[PDB]
């Protein structure tokens, strides 16, 4: 099935505060009203290419989608970000694991870190060897599809893993929607409210 | 055979310096570095400095920036360490050693244990 | 032309006689009173030793990277040091450099022939500038290189060092790739300049405003408010009145900004 | 400068039963680590070539583990023949350093 | 054409022999901008 | 002041770090030409 990317895919383009000003920026965003592929996790995670950037989002009620795999060929020869959420400690690694026939979980390492109701939005782009991650967590109450509304994605982490990425994949926990879009150089007009958060946008 | 021989033993009044020497044998003197170490009875080892016998180069520990000076003679296949202005705190056990910088960076060959006794009287 | 307002008027009109009227002669300015330097109060010295004095560097086909962070990097002991045959800074002046603050400074370390270190440059395409170490166009950062014949050269040839020569399109800057593709070196003490191993370190940093972590060794000073002061926040300089503000910042952003691109609010680094 | 600290100051030991050492440095070294043992005469010999793997010249009774900052040594079976002290040491960046010293005693 | 639109960032990052060329680009651009504005006002003022 | 009045001949003969200076000369000259034309029309339009 496919769905429409209604009002998702706008992130804070830099690290500068602004307020009550309309700012025009040129960067890789997710075009409005585009079609994003909808995958399911009941009764499911093929190859997903990485043309020039990827918008990824998932909606959960039990945190089943738990990770990502990147890289060209995926035989543990190239680095592959790996996230595990063991119900108590956020776990992030970039270890070059060799995965099962189906990469999943069940109910030359270069990093590691330890710290439907919930929609978790991401933006993945690679600029000159920098793997750039933006994220935002938000409450939702909808089982049908992406709720209609606007939210901005601030950056949180930037891992300079220096991979050449042309493909990726998700990781499912077996005893849950996720969406895949692609980014293009769209210019956006960003409306900042008086509190400095992006409140609207025009493609 | 591959082995480093040691100079011997000295009894020296404080103030008088010592020249110390390290007889290399049985290996390619031009392709292995030489490293000098010293320790004291009941205390661990301390590195002083290294020399590349193949071509002139040297690296020194800061705590022995002036007391130790290192030199080598490829023709005799031997290395030398000189200590100046000896003190009672220089009463120490010295080991010459082989260092394979281009190899696994290990101290694969050592001396037989040289004890330097400094006595005021 | 500054004795009194009438003499100033004569100077503006370039005359010794002034007709009746109202004249605009100058501009009123309040001068700054004192200086404010505010840097984060981290004190760990910076581990440049494990980069510059490393026993054996990596080879240029698989050049290394080390993170430099949470350190007060005294770059002076670098620029003061004499061993460096090539300290070249792009987009930053080495003497001024010591006062700035950075958010991600990266050290790249690899060994190449002394002859071709000129190919460590933003353009200057070549066998190593395309397939081995592509340097991005117009960055900010200093390339610091030195002679290593005393250290990394073997009598009879040192062949531990490899550089890739390959038969495809060069991919991207700052990207390492892992007929046969790998060519050995021939480093010999008999070899002079050219075919001579040079150890190379390029410090790449960004010099843009974001929460910083690798600052210079500058002592902080207490900050004074509600009076015209000359302030310095993490290398951001200017003159103005510092007051308490109700602007709600977010953890990833430190600097507010005006329509005309001037700063309008700062976050106190301490 | 790198500082190498060894946690097990003194272990009382009896032959056969398992004993393990560990080395804790101040910062990352990589994997360029060695170990040396000093019999009571004072002559050292190589035991651990690189931090994890035993040198080809040592019996497999000795093994290493950990990388970067946490390093450990395990004894498969201890005996009075193996009465020795182990020094953590690194050679990645100048200056070369040495450990503090850990003792075995009955 | 300069490296930065902020004048202090050139001075705070370059020593003078290099900053002098970078500043000249900002002066030329900003001086031309004023001449454009003033010319527009002189024509508009005549209309009023 | 550039080496050629044709923009493609600079790009077709120089690699970018050199072409960027040569192009800047054409942009400055051509941008000033438009400002001259527009100013002439604004004054002439007022006359009409
Ligand atoms: C890379 O290493 C050099 C050399 O340091 C020396 O050699 C190495 C192989 C190691 O064995 C070091 O332990 C050894 O010191 C460093 O340069 C050195 O910096 C020190 C700073 O303490 C200088 O010490 C001086 O000592 C005199 C007399 O006590 C004082 O007056 C000085 O004020 C200063 O403290 C030393 O002279 C200097 N050596 C040289 C040749 O310049 C270098 O700093 C290091 N790289 C980095 C990034 O740290
Ligand atoms: C990345 O990880 C892979 C595996 O996870 C490792 O590469 C393999 O491991 C060996 C050493 O562990 C690599 O070095 C090779 O060792 C041989 C044996 O001594 C030596 O003759 C060569 O110098 C060779 O490079 C090697 O790349 C690879 N193994 C083989 C058989 O090719 C390694 O830990 C990491 N690096 C690389 C480059 O893979
Ligand atoms: C990342 O890696 C990929 C592959 O690992 C490389 O991109 C391109 O990969 C293809 C694989 O078939 C190479 O073959 C050529 O593809 C082009 C279309 O891309 C086709 O027209 C040719 O006939 C040929 O089949 C291709 O050479 C390769 N491109 C480059 C520039 O190397 C590449 O290594 C990386 N891609 C990036 C960084 O975009
Ligand atoms: C920006 O945030 C501030 C503080 O969070 C808001 O100020 C108050 O917000 C609370 C509820 O959020 C209420 O007391 C009033 O709405 C505000 N009090 C005032 C304005 O005196 C402010 O409303 C926010 N601005 C937005 C959301 O546009
Ligand atoms: C889904 O994508 C198709 C292209 O295959 C497009 O025609 C369609 O309009 C998209 N769906 C929506 C709701 O836009």
mmCIF file of N, CA and C and ligand atoms in Angstrom, chain A residues 50-52 71-73 163-166, chain C residues 166-172 175 177, ligand 3:
data_model
loop_
_atom_site.group_PDB
_atom_site.id
_atom_site.type_symbol
_atom_site.label_atom_id
_atom_site.label_comp_id
_atom_site.label_asym_id
_atom_site.label_seq_id
_atom_site.Cartn_x
_atom_site.Cartn_y
_atom_site.Cartn_z
ATOM 1 N N UNK A 50 18.640 4.282 -1.287
ATOM 2 C CA UNK A 50 19.111 5.467 -0.572
ATOM 3 C C UNK A 50 19.602 6.511 -1.574
ATOM 4 N N UNK A 51 18.761 6.837 -2.561
ATOM 5 C CA UNK A 51 19.153 7.661 -3.705
ATOM 6 C C UNK A 51 19.974 8.892 -3.332
ATOM 7 N N UNK A 52 19.373 9.843 -2.609
ATOM 8 C CA UNK A 52 20.115 11.020 -2.166
ATOM 9 C C UNK A 52 19.702 11.467 -0.770
ATOM 10 N N UNK A 71 24.370 0.781 4.359
ATOM 11 C CA UNK A 71 25.525 0.239 3.679
ATOM 12 C C UNK A 71 25.188 -0.354 2.320
ATOM 13 N N UNK A 72 26.241 -0.565 1.524
ATOM 14 C CA UNK A 72 26.072 -1.008 0.141
ATOM 15 C C UNK A 72 25.657 -2.475 0.041
ATOM 16 N N UNK A 73 26.299 -3.366 0.803
ATOM 17 C CA UNK A 73 26.179 -4.799 0.545
ATOM 18 C C UNK A 73 25.814 -5.646 1.759
ATOM 19 N N UNK A 163 30.510 6.141 5.602
ATOM 20 C CA UNK A 163 30.128 5.044 4.725
ATOM 21 C C UNK A 163 29.792 5.607 3.346
ATOM 22 N N UNK A 164 29.788 4.734 2.346
ATOM 23 C CA UNK A 164 29.113 4.994 1.079
ATOM 24 C C UNK A 164 27.812 4.199 1.118
ATOM 25 N N UNK A 165 26.697 4.893 1.330
ATOM 26 C CA UNK A 165 25.398 4.261 1.530
ATOM 27 C C UNK A 165 24.572 4.424 0.263
ATOM 28 N N UNK A 166 24.063 3.303 -0.260
ATOM 29 C CA UNK A 166 23.111 3.311 -1.364
ATOM 30 C C UNK A 166 21.915 2.405 -1.095
ATOM 31 N N UNK C 166 43.767 2.859 -8.616
ATOM 32 C CA UNK C 166 42.557 2.146 -8.988
ATOM 33 C C UNK C 166 42.098 2.643 -10.353
ATOM 34 N N UNK C 167 41.032 2.029 -10.864
ATOM 35 C CA UNK C 167 40.650 2.155 -12.265
ATOM 36 C C UNK C 167 39.199 2.598 -12.424
ATOM 37 N N UNK C 168 38.651 3.290 -11.426
ATOM 38 C CA UNK C 168 37.264 3.738 -11.496
ATOM 39 C C UNK C 168 37.154 5.235 -11.234
ATOM 40 N N UNK C 169 35.930 5.730 -11.077
ATOM 41 C CA UNK C 169 35.714 7.143 -10.801
ATOM 42 C C UNK C 169 35.977 7.437 -9.330
ATOM 43 N N UNK C 170 36.698 8.525 -9.064
ATOM 44 C CA UNK C 170 36.890 8.973 -7.691
ATOM 45 C C UNK C 170 35.553 9.359 -7.064
ATOM 46 N N UNK C 171 35.328 8.904 -5.829
ATOM 47 C CA UNK C 171 33.973 8.931 -5.277
ATOM 48 C C UNK C 171 33.599 10.289 -4.686
ATOM 49 N N UNK C 172 34.237 10.671 -3.582
ATOM 50 C CA UNK C 172 33.807 11.819 -2.793
ATOM 51 C C UNK C 172 34.975 12.282 -1.937
ATOM 52 N N UNK C 175 36.676 10.502 1.975
ATOM 53 C CA UNK C 175 36.176 9.135 1.894
ATOM 54 C C UNK C 175 37.329 8.202 1.564
ATOM 55 N N UNK C 177 38.661 4.217 0.756
ATOM 56 C CA UNK C 177 38.181 3.022 0.077
ATOM 57 C C UNK C 177 39.029 1.825 0.482
HETATM 58 C C1 LIG G 3 29.107 3.518 -3.583
HETATM 59 O O1 LIG G 3 29.331 2.203 -4.046
HETATM 60 C C2 LIG G 3 28.690 1.945 -5.301
HETATM 61 C C3 LIG G 3 28.789 0.455 -5.534
HETATM 62 O O2 LIG G 3 29.363 -0.207 -4.415
HETATM 63 C C4 LIG G 3 29.367 2.769 -6.390
HETATM 64 O O3 LIG G 3 28.375 3.427 -7.170
HETATM 65 C C5 LIG G 3 28.339 2.847 -8.493
HETATM 66 O O4 LIG G 3 28.126 1.445 -8.419
HETATM 67 C C6 LIG G 3 28.011 0.820 -9.704
HETATM 68 C C7 LIG G 3 27.688 -0.634 -9.451
HETATM 69 O O5 LIG G 3 27.281 -1.291 -10.644
HETATM 70 C C8 LIG G 3 29.298 1.016 -10.503
HETATM 71 O O6 LIG G 3 29.115 0.465 -11.806
HETATM 72 C C9 LIG G 3 28.586 1.407 -12.777
HETATM 73 O O7 LIG G 3 27.281 1.879 -12.442
HETATM 74 C C10 LIG G 3 26.820 2.908 -13.314
HETATM 75 C C11 LIG G 3 25.545 3.483 -12.727
HETATM 76 O O8 LIG G 3 25.813 3.873 -11.383
HETATM 77 C C12 LIG G 3 26.625 2.283 -14.705
HETATM 78 O O9 LIG G 3 26.204 3.284 -15.618
HETATM 79 C C13 LIG G 3 27.946 1.646 -15.192
HETATM 80 O O10 LIG G 3 27.740 0.985 -16.433
HETATM 81 C C14 LIG G 3 28.542 0.699 -14.149
HETATM 82 O O11 LIG G 3 27.698 -0.440 -14.100
HETATM 83 C C15 LIG G 3 29.689 2.489 -10.575
HETATM 84 O O12 LIG G 3 30.997 2.617 -11.122
HETATM 85 C C16 LIG G 3 29.669 3.128 -9.188
HETATM 86 N N1 LIG G 3 29.912 4.559 -9.280
HETATM 87 C C17 LIG G 3 31.061 5.131 -8.905
HETATM 88 C C18 LIG G 3 31.133 6.620 -9.063
HETATM 89 O O13 LIG G 3 31.997 4.478 -8.459
HETATM 90 C C19 LIG G 3 30.307 3.801 -5.776
HETATM 91 O O14 LIG G 3 31.497 3.163 -5.328
HETATM 92 C C20 LIG G 3 29.647 4.523 -4.602
HETATM 93 N N2 LIG G 3 28.592 5.406 -5.074
HETATM 94 C C21 LIG G 3 28.463 6.678 -4.678
HETATM 95 C C22 LIG G 3 29.483 7.169 -3.695
HETATM 96 O O15 LIG G 3 27.564 7.400 -5.096
#
